[PDB]
Amino acid sequence: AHRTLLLRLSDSGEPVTSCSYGQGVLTLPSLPLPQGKKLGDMPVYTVKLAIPAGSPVTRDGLIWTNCPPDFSTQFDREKFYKKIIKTSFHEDDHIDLDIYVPGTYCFYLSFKNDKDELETTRKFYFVVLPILSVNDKFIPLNSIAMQSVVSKWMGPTIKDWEKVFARVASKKYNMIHFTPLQHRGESNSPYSIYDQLEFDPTVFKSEKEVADMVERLRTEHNILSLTDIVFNHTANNSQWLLDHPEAGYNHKTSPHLISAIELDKKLLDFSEQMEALGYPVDLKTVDDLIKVMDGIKEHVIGELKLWEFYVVDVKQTVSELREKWGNSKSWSDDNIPSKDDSTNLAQFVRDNATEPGFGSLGERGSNKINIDKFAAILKKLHSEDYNNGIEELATKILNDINLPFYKEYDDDINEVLEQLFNRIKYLRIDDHGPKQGPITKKLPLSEPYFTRFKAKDGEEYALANNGWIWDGNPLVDFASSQSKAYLRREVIVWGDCVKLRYGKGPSDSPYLWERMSKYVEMNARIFNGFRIDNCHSTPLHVGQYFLDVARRVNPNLYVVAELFSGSEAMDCLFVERLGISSLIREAMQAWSEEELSRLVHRHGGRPIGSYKFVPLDDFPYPADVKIDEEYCAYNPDDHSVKCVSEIMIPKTLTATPPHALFMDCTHDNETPNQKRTVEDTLPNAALVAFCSSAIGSVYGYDEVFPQLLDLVQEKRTYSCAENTGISKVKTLLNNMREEIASEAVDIEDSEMHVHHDGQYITFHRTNAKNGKGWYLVARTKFHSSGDQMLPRIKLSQTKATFKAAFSLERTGDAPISDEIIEGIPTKLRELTGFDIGFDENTKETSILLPQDFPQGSIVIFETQQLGIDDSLDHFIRSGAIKATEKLSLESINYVLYRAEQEEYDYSEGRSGAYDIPDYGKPVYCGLQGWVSILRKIIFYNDLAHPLSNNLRNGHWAVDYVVNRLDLYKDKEGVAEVQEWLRSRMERIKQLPSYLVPSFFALVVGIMYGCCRLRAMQLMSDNVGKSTVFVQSLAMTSIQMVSAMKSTSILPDQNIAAMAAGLPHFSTNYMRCWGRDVFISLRGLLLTTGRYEEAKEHILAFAKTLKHGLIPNLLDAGRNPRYNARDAAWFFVQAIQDYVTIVPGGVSLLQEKVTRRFPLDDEYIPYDDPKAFSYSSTIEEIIYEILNRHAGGIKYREANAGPNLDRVMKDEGFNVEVNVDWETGLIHGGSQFNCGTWMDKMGESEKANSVGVPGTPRDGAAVEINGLLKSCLRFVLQLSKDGKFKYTEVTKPDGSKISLSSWNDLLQENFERCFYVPKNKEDDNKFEIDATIINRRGIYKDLYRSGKPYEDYQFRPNFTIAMVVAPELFTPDYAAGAIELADQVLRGPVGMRTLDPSDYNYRPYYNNGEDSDDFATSKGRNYHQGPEWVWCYGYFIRAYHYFNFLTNPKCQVEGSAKKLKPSSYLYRKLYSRLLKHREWIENSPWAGLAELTNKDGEVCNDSSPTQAWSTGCLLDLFYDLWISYEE
C-alpha cells in the first residue's frame, strides 16, 4: 500500500529539516514487510525527492543515486544511476527512489552552473534499517534485548553452551552477542584472532556445525545472534602472516617506523641484559627510578647515534664536497642570500639542494644534501676555489640547517622517556593498578611495539601491534606516516594483536582485502549481524567496503558499534555512511546519580505532551491530490507508513539521532560490585530497561559476578547456578517491553519524564497514542550514603496500578572456586507498602513510598492517562475535509484571516483577537494567526512558549477558536467547519492539561491545511498546481476579499470587497480604493480564477463614473471622491484584462449598471429618484471615458472645501485634463494637485509645506498615456469583431477624429515625447532641454510638467506603459532603459520611487516626523525614494518581456516551433524574487508589504500586507504560464 516518505530539498539540493530533533541521520523506520511478502515482491520504501520549481539546481539538472533500479540488480557504492529533473518555473518536480532492500544509499545532484560549467552537490545519505524477525514475528529494533557472552567461559562443548543459552532464554533476552568464535591467538584473548577463516577447533570444525547451533538458538529459544568482527588487527602469530608480512606495516611498507623499530629492540635487548646493569629490576621507591632511566640515559639514548635520523651528517657531507667539486661548477642566478642573513641562507639551501623526502623520516641518514647543487651555490656565493673558506662556511650552514632538527629531537626525546617513567610506575608501582612482575621471557620492562618474525620469504620483519593514543584523535592512523606515536612511545599497546595495513583499497594490500572479504561473508551467512570494536579507528573506506560485502550475503545484517569519534557530527557521518543500525551506550560510565539520569534522559525518548508535526503554510497543496477522506485507507496488515491526516501529503523523512543500544554493563567495564556496589545491579538495570531504545547486558551482571573478567587470562567457566540475583527481574522487564513493542512506532509516539532527586531516579514512560504508561521509582546504590526520604509523587489526570517491587540484598561474599566463576549471593525481596491515593475530584493520583525501601530497590507502576483512548487520533484526523466541502473563496477569509479591526466590524467592537498572556495577539483572528505562531513552536517543540503555557493553563484559546465563528456562522460552509472544530475541541478539553497544547496545535493545523487545500481547488489550475510561493501569493486574494458591515463596493448592499491592505485599509471609507482595486484585479482575481467577483468590482465602480472618470476613494459608491486622474485608465485596463482572460468575457460589455449619478457632473444627491434613474452598458461607459477626455473635462471638485481634503488649497480642488492633438496624449493636474498614484499631499506646519503636494504629476504622465494607448488598441480590434459600436470622438470645437487616428498619433508621437536618447547626437528629435537632465537612455516620467526637471526623472512608472502598451517602444531603447531600472531603481523587495542620484532623493518614510524639513516632514517623502512593491511586478513583467525580445541569450527553441525563454532568463527572473519568497515566508501577516524604506529596511508605517504588492507578482506568473506552459 503506502510506504512513501517525502524528502524535500533546498534550492541547493540539500535535504530540509522538518523538525529539530538534534544532530542526526536520515533513518527510515524499521517495519515488517507487508503480510506474507519477501524482499523483492515490492519496494520496501519509496523516497520522494521534491525539488523547488525554478531553483538553480533544476538547470539541466540530474539526480544521482547509487540506489539500484530494481531488486535483481546488486548494490554497488560507486555505480550511480541518472534521473532527470523536470524543470518548471511554476511547479516543483518529484522524483521517486524505490528501495528494494536495506542498506546505505545516497544521492547528489548535478546541474549547470551560472558560469555555464558543471557543478555537483555534497553526497547525502539515508539508511534503510534491516528487518529482524525470529521465526515469523517481527522484532522492532528498539525492543531488542541482548546478552553478551564470552565463549571461552561457556564450557568446552556445544551443549555446555546450549546450557548457557537456556539460562538467558529464561531471562527473555532475544539477542545474543558473541565475542568472536574464531581460533584464538597465543595469549588466547578472543580479540587477537589466530585464523579468521575457521572457528575455534576446541568446539567446532565447520561452518555447518556453527550454523546449526545458531539456527538452533533461533528455532529453540527465539534468539537471534551476532558476532564481534575485528578489522583493526590479527593475532601476533598467524601462519599467513609469515606468508604475507606486507599486510602489516613493516620497514618495507611503512619506512618511517624504522627509527621506532630500532628503539623497540633496544629494549628487548636491554631488559634481560638489565639485571647485570644497574639496580632496579623491581623496586617501589621514587629517588631510585632516576638510577634506572639514567640507565636509559646512557645505555639506550647515548648508544643510538644523536639520531642521524633527523640531522644532516655535517662532516660526511663536506667529505662529499671535496669529491666532485669539479662537475656543475657554479650557479649564476642571484637566488643568493648572503651571509648577513645567516638563517635565510640556511634554508635557502634547504629549498634548492635536497634529495626527495627531506625533513620526513626514513632510513637512518635519509635526510641529505644534493651535493652538486650545493657546490654550485657555494661557488657563486663565496669562491670557486674550495680552500678559500668553504670548510668553515659549508659547515656553518649545515649546523644552522640542523638547529631546528636538533630542537625537533630534544622535544622528541623528552616525550620518549617521560612517557616511559610515568608508565612503568603504574605498570609496577601502583598509582591505581598493581602488579610489579619484574622481568621475564614474556614480560620485559617495555612492551612489544612490534612483532618480530622470520618469514617464509626468508627475510626478517618487524610488524607493530596497534593500541590507542591516550587523548589522540582516532581518525588519525597512528601507524601511518602522519603520526610519530610509535617513536615518542605515545602508544598504549596490545601485544596480542598485530597491525593490519589496508591501504586506499585492494591494490595497497591485496591479500588482506581478499581474506577479510571471505572472513566477513562467512559470518554473514551464519549470523544476523555484526558488532564492531573501536570502529572509530577503522578507516571509513575499509568499513564501508566490507559491511557492503556483508549486506550482499545478509540483506538484513544488523550492526552495532562502540563509536566515540571526536563529536556527535562525526558519529552521525560514520552511521550515515557505514549503515550502522545501533550505537553502544554504557550505563556504567556514569560516575554519579546525576550523570546517570542525564544518560537515561538522552535515550529515554521525547517529553510528555510533545508537539506533533503537520503540513502547515509551508507546503504546497496540489489541487489534484489523493485523500483518505475519513482517514480510513489503512489496513494494519499492509504495514503502511501513515499520512498525518486525510490529505495525502506523505510522511516526511527527517534527520533523527542514530538509534541506541544501551548496555547496563559491557564485557569491558568494571562491575556494580567494583565501581559502585552489587545492590545497584537492580535499579541501574531498571532505568536502562525503561529507555525507549535497545538494551543489552554482559553475562555476569545479572548473576552478580563480583569483578570484571580478565578477557586475556581467566579460564574458569560460567556457573550453572540458575536464577540468581536479577534474572527474575530481567524476565519481567524484557517481557514488559514485548507487550509494549507491539504498538509504539516512531519518535513521536513514545514519551518520557525523568526526575533525579538525590539517590532516587524516577522514570515515567508513556505511549503518546493510547496514554498507557509505566512509572519506575528506582533507588540507587552508588555508595551506602544514609537514609533519604523522597517526596510524594503526583500524577495529574492519571490513575495508577501497582505492578511489582523488589529489593536486592547482599548476603555476604562471593565464593572462591578455581574452575567455576560464581556470583555474589543475594536475596531478592519483594516489597510492599506503596500507597496509591486517587482524588475522584481533581483526578490526581498520589504515590507514597514505604519506609522499608532500601537503596538498591525499585518499584514499578502501570499508569493510564485519562481521556485518551486508542480511537482519539482517528477522530482528530478524520471528518475535516468533508466539513470544508461547502466553503467558498470568500467564506475561507473568515475561517483563516480577519484582522482585529475586521473582526471588530462584525462584533461591534466587542471581540477581536485572542490575547496570549506574556506574548500578544495573533495577527489574524482565524487559523492563519495561530499557524504563524505555531510553525516555529512545533519545529522546536517549545513547550515553554507563552502560547504553550496558556494552552495547558486553560481552555480559553481552545474555546476562542470555536466561538468566533458565531460571528460568521451563516456564511457558506462556516457552520460545518465550526462543528468539526467544536466536536474535536470538545474532546481535547477532556485530556490532561499538559496534553492540550500538542493536540490544539494538531486540530488547528489539520483544519488549516484542509482549508488551504480547499482554496487551491476552487482556484484555477495554474495556481492550484504551483510552488508554495505562488500559492502563498494567491492566498492573499482570500485575505483581501471579504464581506463587511461598515462598507461594501455597493451602496445598496454589503458584499465582497477587496481591501487595499490589512489592518489599516480594511474598514469604512478606508477599505476600497479604485486605483488599488483595478491595479490588483488581474493579479488576485483573474489569475486566480475569481471571475464572477472581478465582474462585481468592475460593475460596482462603473456606477460611480463622473467627469468621465473613475473615483479612487469609493465610499461604497455613496459620495466617492474624484481627484483620481489615474484610476479610470487602470479600470479600463482591468476591463480589457477581464475580457482577454475570462471565457465569454465580451459578455461584460453589455452588462448594465444602474448609473447612480447624473450624466453631467451634476451635484450630489445620493437620496433622489435621479439616482437609480438611468442605465449604462459597460460599452457606453468605456467610450464615455475615451470621448469625454477628448472633448475636454473641466470642473472643480464637488463639495470642495476643507470637509474632504483639509490641507488642499483652494485652487487645488479644480483640476483638469485634455489632449494635445499635435501629440495625441492626455494632460492634467497642476502644482496644487495629486491626480496620480504618487499622491502624497504635504501637511507639516513646522516644515512649512501645508497643501503642497510632494509629487504632483501635472501634464502628460507615462502610465495614463500607456494605458490610453492600450485602451485604443483594445476598442479598435473590438470594433473589428463587432463588439464595440463606436469610432466617434468629439473635440472641444466640434471636430472629429477616428479612434484609429488617435491610436496612430500616440504611435507616431509617444516615444518621441518621452524618450531621452543615449547619444547627444539625436537630442533634436526627442524634444529635450539638455540643461535639465539626469540620465539618458531613459523614458521620461512626465511630458511638460510644471517644474521641468520632474519631467526628466528616472522613476518606476514608465514600466506600466511598457507592460500595457509595448507597441509604443522600439525594442532596443526599451531594453536599455529597463536595464537601467534594474541597476538603479530595483530594491530587494520593492521599486525605488526616485533615482538615488537625484538631490530630492529621500528614501526613508516617517509619517509622524514633526521636524522642519521641507522634503521629509509628515510624510512628503512618500514617493521620492521609498521602495514600493507593486511597482516591482510591472517592472519585472516588462524586464521579462523586453529581455525576451532583445537579448539572444534569453531565447531557446520551441516544441512545434514557438520561441520560449531560455533557462538563462528564468534564472535572472528567479534571482529577483527570492527576497519576496523570503518576505512572505517570514512575515506574521502571510503577505507582502506595501512599501519598504531604503534597501530593504522595514518601514514601520508601511502596511504589512497589501493587495497590489502580491497581485502584481502573480501578474508575472500568469504571463509566463499563459504564454509558455501548454
Author numbering: 3 to 1528
Kindly provide excerpts from the paper associated with this entry.
The structures revealed that CgGDE is composed of four domains, and adopts an elongated structure.
We expressed Candida glabrata GDE (CgGDE, 38% sequence identity to human GDE) in Escherichia coli and crystallized it. Two very similar protomers were found in the ligand-free crystal. Protomer A contains residues 3–1,528, and protomer B contains residues 4–284, 287–330, 336–341, 345–432 and 442–1,528. Residues 629–651 have the largest conformational difference. The orientations of residues 237–458 in these protomers are also different, and are related by a 6° rotation. Our dynamic light-scattering experiments indicated CgGDE is monomeric in solution, like GDE in other species.
